[PDB]
Design a protein around this nucleic acid. Structure first.
Length: 115
DNA sequence: TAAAAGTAAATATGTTTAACCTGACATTTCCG
DNA sequence: CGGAAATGTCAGGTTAAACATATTTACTT
């Protein structure tokens, strides 16, 4: 449905946000630790596990920049290049850089197509 | 004048892996 | 045509996650 990019974190970020070690939620994810995981919305997208405290955030709306580039017929680094070199071209295009992975949303890819 | 020792699970640490962005540059497309 | 903007190549570097192993906690005997 909808997603608030101000409320999403990597596993490492959310781990330190809840006061645990950098690898806490990754270990919980890998070892199926439901007692920990059940408190969060999470989903591994590309090489990043996205976490949110807000259960109303539909993380399946996130698409990696490489996936978005391919959906437009472009080279794999298409959106990474716009983000890094021509960021005015992303104004009004929801996106979030999380460190290993740059993300757009399904909705903001549609807005970009129209542009 | 309880403590020590054992323990399995939880949590943390160090090291490596794979994602995929970065960065310099090349080439193609747009539009006067 | 011609310059500018858009989009492409690819090695390599930086990152979060994975992995392997150790330490700490919580608890019992």
């Amino acid at each position: 449905g909808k997603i608030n990019l101000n409320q999403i974190y990597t596993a490492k970020e959310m781990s330190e946000r809840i006061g645990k070690n950098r690898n806490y939620l990754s270990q919980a994810y890998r070892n199926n630790k439901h007692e920990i995981l059940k408190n969060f919305n999470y989903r591994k997208i590309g090489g990043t596990i996205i976490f949110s405290d807000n259960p109303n955030n539909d993380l399946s709306q996130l698409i990696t920049a490489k996936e978005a580039s391919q959906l437009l017929g472009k080279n794999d680094e298409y959106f990474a290049h716009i983000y890094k070199r021509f960021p005015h071209r992303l104004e009004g295009i929801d996106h979030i850089y999380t460190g290993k992975t740059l993300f757009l949303t399904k909705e903001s890819l549609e807005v970009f197509k129209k542009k």
